[PDB]
Design a protein around this ligand. Structure first.
Ligand SMILES: CC1=C(/C=C/C(C)=C/C=C/C(C)=C/CO)C(C)(C)CCC1
Length: 134
């Protein structure tokens, strides 16, 4: 396990448009979303974690307990509900989102002062990197 606490800004984004296409997100929103460089505020307190993907255009908030399955309301992305579980896999943070879509989930880890995040859905993989600014 590692410590994700902090405020992070996006450095890079790769294959995000195809990842959103796999979720049936409309073209217009896909183009707009891929041009946004959202911040990430993570509050880690024990096994309780809050991850806020921030943008004035639109936000997405996660508030969960590691190891405990919860009903994830993805309103704002594709408006789906998934039975999600986020667990530790060594120093990596694994998330599996069970629902209508195949292979939906993500993996997060740290390299120096950078947050690495890979998102997957329907066999598609998106890669993002963030820099710890606070
Ligand atoms: C579609 C869409 C967006 C998607 C956000 C996503 C897919 C966030 C995933 C966050 C995760 C996995 C956080 C855990 O570290 C954002 C809000 C950028 C802008 C508006 C359009």
């Amino acid at each position: 396990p590692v410590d994700f606490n902090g405020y992070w800004k996006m450095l890079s984004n790769e294959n995000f448009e195809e990842y959103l296409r796999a979720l049936d997100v409309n073209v217009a929103l896909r183009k707009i979303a891929n041009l946004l460089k959202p911040d990430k505020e993570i509050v880690q307190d024990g096994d309780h974690m809050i991850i806020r993907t921030l943008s004035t255009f639109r936000n997405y908030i996660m508030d969960f307990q590691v190891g405990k399955e919860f009903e994830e309301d993805l309103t704002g992305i594709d408006d789906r509900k998934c039975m999600t579980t986020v667990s530790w896999d060594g120093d990596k943070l694994q998330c599996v989102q069970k629902g209508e879509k195949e292979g939906r989930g993500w993996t997060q880890w740290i390299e120096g002062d950078e947050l690495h995040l890979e998102m997957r859905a329907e066999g598609v993989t998106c890669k993002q990197v963030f820099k710890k600014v606070h």
